[PDB]
Structure formats: C-alpha cells, structure tokens
C-alpha cells in the first residue's frame, strides 16, 4: 500500500504522478480527492519516475497539490463466495442490494488465467434451454460460445429472461449455475431483469451483475470479466455447471472504444479497436470444459446488431470468436412471432456436438435436417409465390409454403413465458413434419420415421 | 492567481495555476472573460475560453472561481432566466445598461441583496440528516420553494430562527464534527455531476398532458424521457407548449441551446405568455427558463442541459414533479462535436464524441422517479422531454439513435399529417411507447374498467387502416368488404376525433383521464356494433345511411364540458338503440 | 520589432516583445522600405507570432523592421460611408476623399442579448417569387443561400439587393455587401451592377479579391457587419447585408488554423467552426428600443455538391430558412434555379398574414408545395416507363410541375415581381386542378 | 496458441511452425503445414505497429505486411535439400486469411494472394445453404490447373 | 455575341440542342426499364437526333487534318443541318407519319450530315442540298 | 480487354504508309463495333434475342468471334504482321460491306 500525494500532471481522464516506483501493469490505482471522495483509477504503464493512471469515473473537480494517489499493488479483483448466489453486484463488483456484506474466501484476477488446451475437455451437454426451435435447429452446447444477435425494436431482453428460467440440467438439479451478466442497460430495463428473475424465483439459483448505462465504461468493460470470474469458480471449484449471459454487448464494444478513443489509440475498421477480436477473444474463450473437473461454462453473449447489418465489427469478429450463428430477423418479429428466430442463417457450431447427438433423442439428430431443408424450401416456395401468381407453384411445392408457415406459428414460438421439454420439442417437430409424404422425408431413415408419425 | 504564459486563439495556459483544480471555471486577463480549465502541468493550466480572446497578452492577470461549473440553487432562482451556465440575461441588462453582452463581466446567478422571507418549520436541537428541510421560502405564489440541508453536512441544529434575511446571510447554526457550522439558504451543486438520492424507483405512474393520443397512444410515465421530431411546422412548439401548460407537474423546466436569434427570441417571449389554468398566473413563475443563442458560449450550450437538469433536480430532491423541455438536444450535441473538435480528441461517428452515448445515459438517467434524501423519505420525479433536429433528413443521426435508446418513448412529429392540419401533428405509427403495457395496470384499476383492451383495439384499426391504405390505391374502396370497408369508416372516426384535437379550444384542448376513456369507448362502440350489424343484415352503405346524426355527434362528443361528463357518455345509449332501428 | 527570430513562409516570429495582444495587428517595414502588415494569432512569452498578409516575399529579418500598432482589426465608421467601395480591410479601392472624421470600431463587436432582441415582424419583398410565396422572408431574420459551384449565385445575390425593399418603412433598404474571395469577374459584376442601376450610392461595398489575404479575407465578413450594425444600431437606418463567397471564409479559416498548426476538425474545417460561423452570422435582426433593422443573407458555395459538408450543415443551424439550388434546374436553363421543396424558411409566418401579406398566402403554399411535390414524383415515374402507365391526375400534375417551374419557378433574375403578382400568377398556375381536390374553404374569391 | 494467449506469441507460432515443417522437409519428405488463421498473425502485428507509434499502410496493419506474407509463403515449395544426397522435400502450405465482413478487400487476402498460386474462396450463401465445401467453383481460382491435368 | 455576327441566335441552337441531349440522358434511365424499341415516335427521334448531333458534333478526329480544325462558319452550318433534321423530321410526326417510315430511305442524305464535318471549311457545300435535300427527301413521305 | 486499353502513339508508329496502310481505320471500327457489340451481347441477356434488334445482334455475334479468334491468339502462338491485318478484316466484313462506313469503297474492294 502505497499513497502519494504529489501529482505532476492532469490532462483529461489521464493523470501523471511523478517520483513512483514499483508501480505494476495493469495495477488498479486510487486516489482520494480533497474533499475525501474517492475515485477508482487504471494505469496503463509505469515507466521509471513516472505514474500515469486513467481515472474511470473521470477527472474533473480534482487538485493535483491537494490530491492523494494510493496504490494498491493488484489487477482489478472480484471476491468470491459460495453463497454469492442470489445477490446482485455492481460492476465495481459491490452488491447493490446492500445485502449482508458478502465474505470472500478468496481474491482473483477478473481476467482469469487461460485453459490449457491440452488440459481442455470437448463440451458433453446441452440445457435445452428455452425455445424448442431453437434447439431442435441447433443444439446449445455445454461450455460452448454462443452468438445471439439483436437489433433495436427487437425484444433481445426477453429472449435472455426466458432462457435464464427455462435453462434446466436433466441430470440433477442440484449443482446447477446460472450466471445473468448485464451491460449498458437502463434502470428500468435492468429493473425487468431483477423484477423478472425474483418473480420466477429463479434468482436464487443464479448470481446476478447489474450494469447502468449511466456507470463508468471501464466499469462497463470490467462487468464481463467478473461475471466470468465468478462463473469460472463455481464450475472449475464448486462443480456446478455454470451458464453465463451478456446483454448490450455492443455497448461492452461501444464503451471500449470511448476508452480507447481517451487513450488517443488508432480507431480499427468502423471505428471499433482494431484488436477487438482479441479483446473480445478471452471473454468469449473463457467457456469451456476442463478434463478432471466437474460442470462446464457455457456463454451467450447478446450483442445487438445496428442497422439490421451482418458485417458490422462486433456481429462479424463475434461470429470468429464464438462457436455457432443465432440470428433474429425483423420479419418475424413483424408477425409478433416470439421468440422471433431465423433459423437459416443462425447455426450452432458443433450442433452435433455435444447435442445429441442422439442423446437428445433416437432420430433428433436426423430429424433437425430434414426439417431444415422442408423449409428452406418452404421459404423459397412462398417467395416464388410473390414473383408469379401463387397457383404457378406446383401442387407438391404448395404444401411446403403451407409447411413454412406452420413451421413459423408454432416452431418458431412458443411464447415468451411458456417452456418446452425436449420430447415435446420433437413430438411436435414429428407432427409438423407429417405433411409431407413419407417418401418425400427421404433424408431420414425408415425405423425411425415407421416409429414416429 | 496565475500570469498568462501564453494566449494563441482559444487556448490558454497560465503560470502559477497549480492550486486550481480541474474543469475548474476562471477569469482571463484585464476583461476576465469566462474560461475553462481541462488539464494542469503543473502549474501551469490550459484553461480554455469561450468569450474572444482578442486584446488579451502575456502577462495578464488569472482569477480561478476555485469550482467546476455548478448551478446555483436558492430563493428568486424561479421565474428568472438564465443563460446554459445560469448567468441571468435579464440582470444583466439591467447592469450592462446596454443590451449587447459584455465580455470580461460577471453576475451573480441568484441576487443576494433580494430578501426572501423565511418560516422554519423544524424545532431547535432536531437531528439533522442529509435532504433534511429546515424551512420554506416562498418565491413564486404558484410554487413554494423548499430548503434542503446542504450535501455533506451532518449535526445538531442549536439555533433555529424564522426571519427576514438575505440568501448570503445564515439564517441557522448546525453543528457539526468538525465544528459548528452556518448553512447559507443559497446552495451551489455541480451541473455536471448527478444529485445525491436515497433510492431510486421505477416509475409506474402514467403523467397526463391533456392531449388524447399522447395519454392513450403513448402515455408518459413519471420521470419518463421522450424524444420528439424537430422537423418545422409540425406545431411542436404548439406540443411542447401544450405539454407545460396542461402538465401534471409543478415545475416546468426549458433548455437547450442555440435557438436561432429570431427562432430563440420567440420563446423568451411566448413562453412567458403561457398562463397555467389552474394557478392562474404566468406560467413562467412556476419554473426556470434557461435561453442561449448559437453565438453564446460552447459550454454553456453543451452544458445548458447540464444545468437545467440539476434546477429540476433540487425542486426534484424537494419531492415535487418536475419536468425538463430541452430544444434542441440535436444543438447541445452540435455543440458537442464541436467541443471535441477542439479538445482534438480522436472523431468518433458523424464527428461527434465517442462517449457521446455516455453524455445522453447522464442528462437522460438522472430524470425518473426517486427517493429524495432526508428523513421524510419524499419522492420527486422529474419528467424530461428532448426535441433532437439532426437537419440530415436521416434517422441514423448518432444523437437520435443513442437517444433512442435510453429513452422509453418515441414521439413522431411528421410534417405530412402537419399539412393536412391535423393537429396534434404525431404519427401514431411512426411512434412507439414500451411504456404503454405499464399504463394498462394503473388505468384499468383507476378507470374500473379495462382500459388496455380499449387501446390495444384502437392500434389495431389504426394499423389496419395502413394495411387497407395499399389496397385502396390497387382496388377501389368499393371492391373491398364491407367487413375491410367499416375499418376505413372506424379509423376515420378515431382520427377525426381522438387524433385531430384543436390546441386553441381549452374543453378541446385539455381532456380528463375520464373523458378520454369516454371518447374512445363511443368509437370503439360503434365497432362492435356496426360489425355486427354488417355481418348479417343490413349492408354496409344502409349502417352508414341514417347513421350521419348519431356519427356526427360523436364527432362532436370532444368539445362536451368536463363537467357534463355523462352527457358525451350517453353516445351508447343511441348506437345501442339505432342498430335496433336498422333491423326491420 | 525590427527584431525578428523566425521568418517562415506567411507568418513571421518576434522575439522579446512585451504587451503584445491577440488579434492585435502588425506593421511591418522592409529592408527596402516596403511596408506590410499583418494580424497576430498567438504571441509567446518571449515571442510572438504573426503572419504578414501581403507576403513574406523579399523580406529579410535582421534588415526588417516589424511595429505594433496597438489595436485589433477595425473599421472607421462614419455615415457618409455610404456609396463607397473599400477593400476587406476599409481601405477605400475607389480611392474616393470621403475624409471621414469619427470614431472608430472593432470589428468582432459583442453578443446580442437573446432576451434583448426582437423578432422580425415586417415583411420584405425579395424580388423573387420563388422566395416570398414558397418561403417567406422578414426583416430582421438570417436568410442562407446554398449554391452549388458553377451555379448562378451571383446574379441572385445582386439581384435581392436591387429588388429587395422593406414594406410600408417608407425608407431605402441601405445594405452591406461584402465581396469575399471571388474573382475579378465575379467582383467587377457586383460594382457594375451597383453603378449601372446608381443604388450603389444607397450601398456600402467592401471587396476581396480571391489574390487577397487569406486573414484579410476572414476579416472583411467582420468588417463588413461593424458597418451593418453602426448604421442599424446608430444611425438608424434599415439595414440588408449580404455576403459571399461564405465558402471562400470557410476555407480561409483553415489556411490560418493550419499555418498556427491546430488539428483541424471533422472534413478538415476548424473543430470551433460552428462558434466562429455563428458570431459572423449572430449578429443580425431588431435590437429593442432601436429604429435600425439587420436583414442577413448568406451566400455559400457546396463543396462536392454535399448537403451534409459542414458549411451548409452548420449554417443551417445558426441561419434561419433554407435556400437550395439544384444544378438541374440551372441545367434547365431557368433562372432562378434553386428547388422548392429542398429549402424552407421558419420564420416565415411571421410575415405572412392579413395587410403585411395576401392572408390566403398560408392555403396557396400548402396547395403549390402539395401539388408540385407530387408533380416530381410524377416526374421521376413517368419517366421512366412509357406510356401511359401513370395516372390520369398524374399527368395533370406533371403538366403543373413544368408550368410552376418554367414560369414561377424562375422569373429571371432582370426581372421584378411585385406580392400581389406573384401570388396572382400563383392562382392561375394552381387553377388547373380540380375544385374539388384540395385548401381553403373560400377558394372561390381568388378563382 | 488460443487467442487469449499473447496476441504477439501469433507472430511466434507461425515461424515456429514453418521451421519445424523445414527440418523435416529437409530430411526428403513431402510435408503439409495448416496455420489457421493467418489471419490473425496479422492482427498481431497491427497491435504492434500502432503503439510503437509507427505508420499503418492500409486498413492499420503495417505497410509491410504483405511482405512477411511473401517471405513465410515463399519458404513453402519444392526444393532441394542440402548435402551429397541431394534429397527432395515438398511443404505445401494451407492458410486460410479470413477477410472483414466476407469482404475480398481485407489487405491480407490481397497481398496474400498474389503470391499463393492456388485460389479457394468460400461463400457465405453457399454456407447458408449449409452444404460444403462451400467453396465458389467460379470465383476461386487455380494456376496449377493446368499443371495438374497431364 | 455570336448572335451579332450571322443573324441567327447562337442561344436558339444552343439551347435547343442543348434540351435533346438533356432529354436523352433522362430517355436512357427510361431505355433501361423498358424495351429500347418500344417508346413514342416523338421520344424516338429525339434519341436519332441526339445520336445524330454526336456522331456529326464531338465525333471530330485529332489525328484527321480536316475534322481536327472546324472553322466557325463551319460550325453554324453543320450545327444548323443536323438541327434542321430534327425540326424537319418533327413536323413528318405531326403529319401522322410513323418514325420508321421516315427514317428509312434517309441514308443517303444523313451520311452527308454525318461526313459534313470532314469536307473543306471553304469549299462549303457542306452541305447545301442537306438544306434543302432534307426537305425534299422528308416532303416525299 | 481491349476497351480500357488504348495506345497514346499508335498513330505515329503506324504508317499509311508502312506497316499497315489500313491499320488507322481498321482500328476505329473494331473498336466501335466491339463496343457496340459488347453493348448488344449485355442488352440481349437482360431481355434476350427478342428484345435486341436484328442489327445489334450481328455486332454481338460479331463481338464474340472478337473474342474466340481475334482477341485472343494464344500465349505459345505467332501472328505475322501481314495475317494479322487479313484476320482483322475478315471479322468486320462478315458484316455487310455496305454497312461499315469508316474505310473507303476502293480499299475493300
């Protein structure tokens, strides 16, 4: 601990503090104003006789004579507890609830160390979780990346509340972790989660962090790493299969470029860090399954896509660094068809696997294909339907447009507060898939489409 | 005081300046114009200046306010206007004796030597904690001002006194750990930095301007932002106006800068015309007005909506409603990308700053419904209300989208609808209100009936209406159903009526809660009873037919007293009796 | 000083000086005993820096003698200044003896009180139907005119000037006109024009040639408003300004901004851009307790043809009203060329309304911008497919788009229109139309 | 190396990578080296020029980057080994450079192009359609084609 | 100027023609959506008189001693020929007659005006029936 | 390509003269029919045969052989000066001699 209370120079967020040694990278900073108010701080580099730290909340109102710059030798830290379960904690990591103060055993670096790839395990489970569509057409996986994209007017927040209390383990549920990470988010739209979460009784089960719009973007930036953190410990040490959800990402993408843009650092493409994809690599790399530990961390990082476009930085460099494609299009959300989903351009990667990949059941994995390509071609029938005169379409054709849409009406929702079972998934897939004849499902075998109807 | 090392346009750096603090307002040479310091070397301070630096050398004199920019808060600041930094206009005439503004000549934002009476309403020895109100001070006769213990001050009052006194003068002691301490009625806050609450809550109470669509088709919760078109006459002067003066709240708060001289100056002069019904005095006593023009000070226009929040903030932690009318935000950013220019920081998109988002999550975060601090646990919620004019004719302008965003409610001006008259100019699909589900609980339980079914209904039509508006242009009207076709006539009504409403006409300008209800149920009526009735029976054109009296005094049903509320509710009665009537 | 440490291109650096103001200008002496002066942007503590606006051409330090001269840019104001055309900085080009004995004035003045100013509440012809019934001008509001490079702007500029007369004053519209950055041509134009009609006695003129000081050129839109405001705000006289080539400051500024080094702002202009803009425009509408009357119209030249470059962006947020030319409608041949639909005046409703102007104004406008807005829309349809694929109203409509922009659109720019013709012409135009599609309920009284 | 390991340990593991494949290419055997992604060796070099401070020739990576791509692709080839024995061993090196957005106008496509004589170019419809290879028959291109066929 | 030294307006020819090349500019946007074949005999021959004026106008040859100095004189009369075409042509229209009708049989008169260009600039001549030749060849439909 | 392509001294290399004395007009009309034929090969996929005229249809067909003979030679083959000359003419005179007006009535014959 170490408190100097001479600052050489202040200039914008960034403030140098001359005659320092043993300064650190990446070595939170604090320093107490006169008046006594204490503001949080990140040095960037300590060069010799020299202290240059970045002050989140920022700058103003400060008096470099009558300031005082401690510091506090760690990177940016979140305690742990077991029972931290059920309490809700600010990006600085302090429980806004102001709940019994929570007692951590241990403290840990919020950016983690990386998995070993050779000590890595291949994910083996998936939570069903959620809309049956979505995982009938691709299976989420355990401690697998998972790429939801959202756009403005889109009810992304919805799909993450439901998932959060639809998301169950089959095997037991007694070790079972749900982690909701919120990011740039307003007050009342945090307050949806919080009142959503209680409601359900669901918050219990799962450990929340809360993000305000209005907070410091490096306390934005640091939210989901130390939800990782905190999900990481109760996967790799409590055993509990954990599964984490950011919202906003693009606010996480957004807040680090107006840290970036402090820093005078070179804007990459679309004005986003050129090295964004690193940045957002080890957050998004962090899920995973280790060989000799118990549970798994599974991610979906929630970003919202702007002007409805694909290639844009985030969706696009996302897309690298997380495993699988979920997709939401403006379409169906037109219809009031929720959860709105479009399942041609969104993929989970592996679906297989882990999912079932007969696990799930006797002929899901053959199943889920010969429903994609009845409506890829449902959805190539009707749009030939809007070209010419929709009597050119070829009897046979009809009945895939008809297939289409009764697809849409129930498969792709199923509301935002009702849950389907695995078996009910399919039961109903089965059903849908009856229309066409029995010679016509050709991709799938025959013990298996003789014992469903 | 700091010697200017050197002076090169805008920017200044000054010696000696190490006790200074940042951000940190100061004055500058012989004039001592009004200036800004961001960075220190130290000593040596790059303060920056708004007002010209023109005759200004190496060697002039530097004065540092010793504080970043704050409002000062405190009797006689109501009914006043002052500039995005708060100096006051009007006083300034008065002490410039001249009508242009001086440079290097500073006024005091409240008037000290104005004395306000003071009545204390605590006791002597009562504890005192942090929001607490000692006494009232009543400078307006519509608003009665309230004094809140000074943020960070905590002890034991020994004194207590209620006197004629200056604000600059202590009208009590309070102890405190330190020592004892005198509290100035005067309070000074930053602008900047957010006010101090105990708790904040989420705002489930619907807020009635009195215009039908805005109530019924996108209500406004307590604290509630919206965001508005500034396209020209779409009559949202007419709106905003509307707004202020039919507003629930007790104080309306005006910002935003640079009007246009002569687009400026008629707001300076119309607004004071505004007489609230209810008080009936000007209803400029009742709030603060702040107006700058382009020419002023960058930061007191990018800051003027700074300095407007945190007037509606104090009145706000006194737990009274306020609201905030900000024209134009799009100017405030304007100044913004502006201010960045010249910072020379990296551009972000559409030149603005890329913590632009994080400047409007402030302003716009700070309005809502909160727990004020003090004992008493008051609530005040201060209901903002931003005009953006981006001028690029996209709807992709950085300023509207992250607006947008943190905002709860879209409102649609639209120039179309404003030349065909139709007042108030919003378009109801243009706009959007998430708001509007929360509304359905708080009206179905205050009406007694289900007002969600009523409105969700009306959407419907309206939307169908868009739907039946393409087809119309490909087939007549005639060759649609008469099913389709009485979707036309039921649209109809509800624009004629619930969306065109006369701002001119007080019974028709300002509409009851009960009345509303009232207005839409007679439209909504007919509906059910028309479809009905063209399902089997009669025709389409017989239901028009002899339907033109019972029609036309719906039509009219809006400019019913609010009084004789039961009257324009008898419409029922009527299309109940005259579908009997078609039946023969 | 005759001491000078660095002399680098335009600007110049002076060492050991004391008291030395910013925007305080210089005098500088040559070797030779050439004399050249020039406007101070920044001064260090030990030295200070200027740049001379005639050149740094044969000029060498040790032997050149620099002097202050104790004061920022300004004009000596005088009221027989009238009819006498000077260059950016007053010195007379005509060379004319006015001998003017009063005093002097700074030409960056101070800030209008929003509180203290009054709106504009006389109407004033603008000699162009164009912009009186599509738009609506009056006294005392900023009036910007967008021009696109190669288009007519400067017989439109001359041609308010001449035909612009305040409404029932009873007085001579007295203007500024400030020539800056243009071409001989374009220059010799403005003072022949002046000569030709003899109002140019009536005017006060300052010119800046494209050859000129760049700083020269950013001061004379100063200069020129000192003089503006002198004759509002003392003299009492009604007073119109305007003022181009904007573009040509817009550009000068950056000169200056780049030779002192500063980072310049988004699409290479000044970051300060809006503030500088604004104070140059600021200044302009009725001032309470005054008899004297400001009418500002701006005239800028698009970069690149682009609404959105900064200059138009800005200017449309400080100035009042939009006035827009398209190239086509020059292409046309048709003079005036500017669009309709494109530019829209605020304030102008003000002016419009019973006595000032034809009350049923407000229904006419509606009806022409409705009707001719859709006649584009026609237009662009109906192009391209033929024939007969648009409808029997379309084509109507289409017959009024040509007719209002062939006729009313464009009455040349020799040409004057009073109110009562334009809105006259506006009815028979606008007859074509059914009665019944619409408007007025008393559409019957004009036709 | 994960991406969460060192950004600048990318530049590493692919010079690593072609030297090992060298010392046995060396030896006489036909080896096949596989860096995916290269892509991302030359982020790690952009992450490098800019806080040194140094100029970015396009899209920010530095303005030699094409050769880098030049001199590791240049090593992968046919040659002959050193010594009496005159051995032969044959590298061939697949690396796929994926472009911003599926855009052929990332600069690491380009300047790695030019020097690789053999085109594979998938499509981000075909993808969507969900059948592989998704590469583009027409679009990609191939020189050995005709070096191939006898 | 130029008006003041032929006793015809440089204006009218200039301005008129000016108006048949904005037209086919306007008319190609038109060529895109629809067959090039299918459009008013009146528009039709706008696009032959505009093609007309840059195959006679703007087509001169550099490298060609004749077509690369045209004498001002030269100008008016080659300017006149290929507008007077157009005129002609118009008033066939005007008369009922159907665009191909009055185009065939006009190959022999138009490579006059196309070659107008390249004969002597003093000789002239260039031509003299092509004012009148027009007429006569368009009169005989 | 042979469109984005054209040599600044093409002219003065070339004689009337040696080597080609039709090689200055031969280039005008291969470069203008193929241009018009180039934009007669373009109209006829968006609308077909049907929609082209008779006349573009010949320049398009002629546009191609441009291609499959003239345009390309081969990258092992060798054209004298004098075949290259006869190549070139042949492709334009399959057209009507009447219908290319650039060269001279004596010099096709």
């Known amino acids: 601990i170490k408190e100097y209370r001479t600052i050489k120079e202040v200039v ?23 008046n006594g108010e204490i503001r949080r701080g990140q040095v960037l580099e300590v060069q010799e006789d020299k202290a240059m730290v970045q002050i989140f909340e920022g700058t103003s109102g400060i008096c470099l004579k009558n300031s005082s710059v401690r510091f506090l030798g760690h990177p940016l830290q979140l305690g742990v507890s077991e029972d931290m379960i059920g309490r809700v904690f600010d990006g600085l990591g302090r429980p806004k609830d102001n709940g019994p103060e929570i007692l951590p055993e241990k403290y840990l670096d919020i950016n983690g160390e990386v998995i070993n790839p050779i000590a890595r395990d291949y994910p083996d489970e998936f939570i069903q979780t959620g809309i049956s569509a979505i995982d009938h057409l691709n299976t989420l996986v355990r401690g697998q990346k998972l790429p939801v994209f959202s756009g403005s007017g889109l009810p992304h927040k919805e799909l993450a509340a439901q998932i959060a209390r639809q998301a169950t383990v ?79 990402m693009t606010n996480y993408a957004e807040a680090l470029r107006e840290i970036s843009a402090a820093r005078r650092e070179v804007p990459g493409r679309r004005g986003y860090p050129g090295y964004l994809y690193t940045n957002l690599a080890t957050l998004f790399e962090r899920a995973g399954r280790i060989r000799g530990l118990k549970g798994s961390v599974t991610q979906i990082p929630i970003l919202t896509m702007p002007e409805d476009d694909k290639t844009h930085p985030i969706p696009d460099l996302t897309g690298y660094i997380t495993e699988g494609q979920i997709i939401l299009t403006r379409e169906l959300y037109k219809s009031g068809i929720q959860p709105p989903i479009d399942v041609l351009p969104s993929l989970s990667r592996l679906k297989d696997k882990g999912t079932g990949a007969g696990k799930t059941r006797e002929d899901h994995a053959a199943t889920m294909n010969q429903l ?17 005169g929709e009597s050119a379409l070829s009897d046979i054709d009809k009945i895939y447009a008809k297939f289409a849409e009764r697809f849409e009406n129930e498969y792709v929702n199923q509301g935002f507060y009702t849950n389907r079972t695995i078996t009910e998934t399919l039961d109903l897939g089965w059903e849908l898939l009856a229309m066409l004849p029995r010679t016509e499902l050709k991709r799938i075998k025959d013990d298996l489409l003789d014992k469903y109807l | ?112 030597e104005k004395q306000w009476w003071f009545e204390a309403t605590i006791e002597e020895g009562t504890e005192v904690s942090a929001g607490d109100i000692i006494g009232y001070v009543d400078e307006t006769k519509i608003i009665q001002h309230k004094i809140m213990v000074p943020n960070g001050i905590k ?195 559409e030149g603005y700053p890329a913590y632009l988002g994080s400047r409007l999550a402030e302003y716009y975060e700070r309005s809502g419904r909160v727990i004020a601090l003090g004992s008493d646990q008051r609530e005040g919620s201060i209901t903002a ?74 959407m419907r039509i309206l939307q169908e209406e868009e739907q039946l508006n393409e087809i119309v242009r490909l087939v007549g009207i005639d060759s649609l159903s008469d099913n389709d076709r009485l979707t036309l006539e039921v649209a109809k009504s509800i624009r004629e009526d619930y969306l065109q409403q006369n701002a001119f006409d007080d019974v028709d300008t300002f509409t009851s809660r009960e009345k509303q209800f009232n207005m839409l149920k007679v439209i909504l009526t007919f509906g059910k009873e028309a479809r009905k009735a063209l399902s089997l029976g009669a025709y389409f054109n017989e239901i028009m037919e002899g339907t033109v009296a019972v029609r036309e005094r719906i039509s009219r049903s809006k400019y019913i007293p609010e009084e004789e509320l039961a009257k324009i509710s008898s419409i029922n009665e009527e299309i109940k009796e005259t579908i009997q009537l078609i039946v023969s």
């Open chain 1, 12 to 34: 914008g967020p960034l403030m140098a503090v001359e005659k320092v040694s043993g300064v650190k990278y990446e070595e939170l900073i604090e320093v107490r104003m006169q």
């Open chain 1, 170 to 248: 089959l095997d037991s549920s007694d070790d079972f972790a749900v982690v909701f990470a919120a990011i740039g988010i307003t007050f009342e739209e945090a307050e949806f989660f919080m009142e959503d979460f209680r409601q359900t009784g669901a918050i219990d089960r799962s450990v929340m962090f809360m993000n305000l719009a209005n907070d410091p973007a490096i306390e934005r930036i640091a939210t989901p790493r130390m939800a990782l953190t905190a999900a990481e410990y109760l996967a790799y040490e409590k055993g509990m299969h954990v599964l984490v959800i950011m919202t906003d």
């Open chain 1, 372 to 388: 994609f390509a009845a409506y890829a071609q449902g959805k190539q029938a009707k749009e030939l339907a809007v070209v010419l």
């Open chain 2, 1 to 112: 005081i700091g010697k200017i090392i050197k002076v090169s346009g805008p920017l200044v750096m000054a010696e000696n300046m190490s006790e200074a603090c940042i951000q940190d307002m100061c004055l500058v040479g012989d004039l001592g114009v009004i200036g800004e310091i961001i960075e220190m070397r130290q000593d040596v301070a790059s303060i920056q200046v708004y007002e010209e630096t023109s005759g200004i050398g190496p060697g002039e004199p530097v004065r540092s306010t010793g504080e970043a920019l704050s409002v000062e808060l405190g009797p006689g600041i109501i009914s006043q206007m002052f500039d995005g930094i708060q100096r006051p206009l009007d006083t300034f005439m008065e002490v410039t004796q001249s009508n242009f503004l001086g440079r290097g000549v500073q006024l005091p934002a409240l008037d000290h």
């Open chain 2, 155 to 349: 002890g034991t009052v020994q004194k207590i006194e209620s006197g004629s006194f200056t604000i600059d003068d202590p009208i009590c002691v309070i102890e405190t750990e330190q020592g004892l301490k005198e509290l100035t009625m005067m309070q000074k806050w930053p602008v900047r930095r957010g006010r101090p609450i105990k708790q904040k809550l989420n705002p489930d109470v619907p807020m009635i301007t009195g215009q039908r669509v805005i109530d019924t088709f996108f209500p406004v919760t307590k604290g509630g932002a919206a965001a508005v078109p500034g396209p020209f006459g779409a009559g949202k002067t007419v709106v905003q106006h509307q707004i202020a003066k039919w507003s629930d709240v007790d104080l309306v708060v005006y910002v935003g800068c640079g009007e246009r001289g002569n687009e400026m100056t008629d707001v300076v002069n119309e607004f004071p015309e505004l007489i609230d019904p209810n008080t009936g005095e000007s209803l400029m006593e009742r709030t603060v007005l702040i107006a700058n023009t382009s020419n002023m000070p960058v930061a007191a226009r990018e800051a003027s909506i700074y300095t407007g929040i945190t007037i509606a903030e104090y009145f706000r932690d006194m737990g009274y409603d306020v609201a905030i009318m900000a024209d134009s935000t799009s100017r405030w950013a304007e100044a913004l990308r502006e201010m960045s220019g010249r910072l020379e920081e990296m551009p972000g998109d």
């Open chain 2, 385 to 458: 209300i931003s005009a953006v004019s981006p001028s690029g004719g996209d709807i992709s302008e950085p300023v509207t989208q992250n607006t947008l965003r943190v905002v709860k409610v879209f409102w649609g001006l639209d120039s179309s609808l404003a030349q065909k008259r139709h007042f108030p100019s919003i378009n109801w699909i243009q706009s959007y209100s998430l708001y509007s589900t929360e509304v359905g609980r708080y009206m179905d339980q205050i009406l007694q009936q289900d007002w969600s079914d009523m409105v969700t209904e009306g």
